[PDB]
Structures are given as C-alpha cells and as structure tokens.
C-alpha cells in the first residue's frame, strides 16, 4: 500500500508533479522535499481564491458552469488578484463594465 504525498500534506493539487517540474525546470541544482509541498499549497490557494470569486460572479449571472468571463470579473474586481494577474489578458474576458462620470448625461 503506497499513499500519495498530497494526502500526507492534505492538499488536492499534486505535490509529486510539482516536484518533477521543479526538478526538470532546473530552477536550481537540488530541490528539497518540502519545497514542492509548499508550492502545491500556495498554488491551490491561489487557484481557490480565484475559483471562489468566480463562483460568486457566476451565480450572479445565473449560469451553472463557469465560463471564461466569470474569471475576468473575479480578477478585475479584486484588487489583489489584479496586481498579480495584472499584465495578463484572459481569454474572452471583456472588460470590467465602466463609464466615466463626465460622459454621463447631465
């Protein structure tokens, strides 16, 4: 019986894969055991906050499945995810709806 490293760490993202990748990435000569565990831990978090915010967006537009648009809202509405994904252009996102105050009718 062989268990996975993710269940040892309590995660859903793969810790094993993120080790290989770290190794073959040659980011550095030697990689320790806890480095892929921490990275999988941070990646799942960032994948979660973004998925939550997307879930908050979708239900609003009363759509069952998340579609690429819901992911732009989530990112541009939030002021953190927007600095992170700030020079990133998501597919089929549109833009945050916004019109300037001087362009409004009097």
């Amino acid at each position: 019986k062989a268990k996975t490293r993710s269940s040892r760490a309590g995660l859903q993202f793969p810790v094993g894969r993120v080790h290989r990748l770290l190794r073959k990435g040659n980011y550095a000569e030697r990689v320790g055991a806890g480095a892929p565990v921490y990275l999988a831990a941070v990646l799942e978090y960032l994948t979660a906050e973004i998925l939550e915010l997307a879930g908050n967006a979708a239900r609003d537009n009363k759509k069952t499945r998340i579609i690429p648009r819901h992911l732009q809202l989530a990112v541009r509405n939030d002021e953190e995810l927007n600095k992170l994904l700030g020079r990133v252009t998501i597919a089929q996102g549109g833009v945050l709806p916004n019109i300037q105050s001087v362009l409004l009718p009097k």
Binding site: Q12, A28, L43, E52
Partner: protein, 94 residues
C-alpha cells in the same frame, strides 16, 4: 500523446469549494495556464534568491521569501499561512 495538466486537481479543489458548480474547458485552460504561470514566477524568483545567497537548493524557505516577494499584499499572508500549515502537516505525517 499524454498531456500533463492540472485538470482533475483544480476540479477537485473546485468541488471542495463549490460541490455544485461546473467549469468550461476554455476556462479550464485559463486556470491551467494561470497556475503554470504563477508556478513559473514563484519558482524562478526562488531560483534567483538562491543564486544570490550562494545556496544551491530550493528550500521551502525560498518559496516563501518568494511568495512574499511576488504575490502582492494580503494574497501573500494567506498564501504563506496555508503553505506553512501544509508543510507542517507534511512533516507531521512524515
């Protein structure tokens, strides 16, 4: 032919968050490229840090100095906290 990507993993964590919500495939690819990109940025900064400090190994420490150098503002604190409790559970479960 075998294509490695984070499909089932992000789906799982999605049900962990929302066990009622679907996902688009293109939107998936958005998620997969996004986690790949942030992984590249966190791992690269780490590699750099190390090469500056004349070290040679990517300790969980570097990934932190990194997450706190890349992820902006609060997104960091909550990243660290979760990474530290994750590696704590990894060492507790050995």
């Amino acid at each position: 032919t075998r294509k490695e990507s984070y499909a089932i993993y992000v789906y799982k964590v999605l049900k962990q968050v929302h066990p009622d919500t679907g996902i688009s495939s293109k939107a998936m690819s958005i998620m997969n490229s996004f986690v790949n990109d942030v992984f590249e940025r966190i791992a690269g900064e780490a590699s750099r840090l190390a090469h500056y400090n004349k070290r040679s190994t990517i300790t969980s420490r570097e990934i932190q100095t990194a997450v706190r150098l890349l992820l902006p503002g609060e997104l960091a604190k909550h990243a660290v906290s979760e990474g530290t409790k994750a590696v704590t559970k990894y060492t507790s479960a050995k």
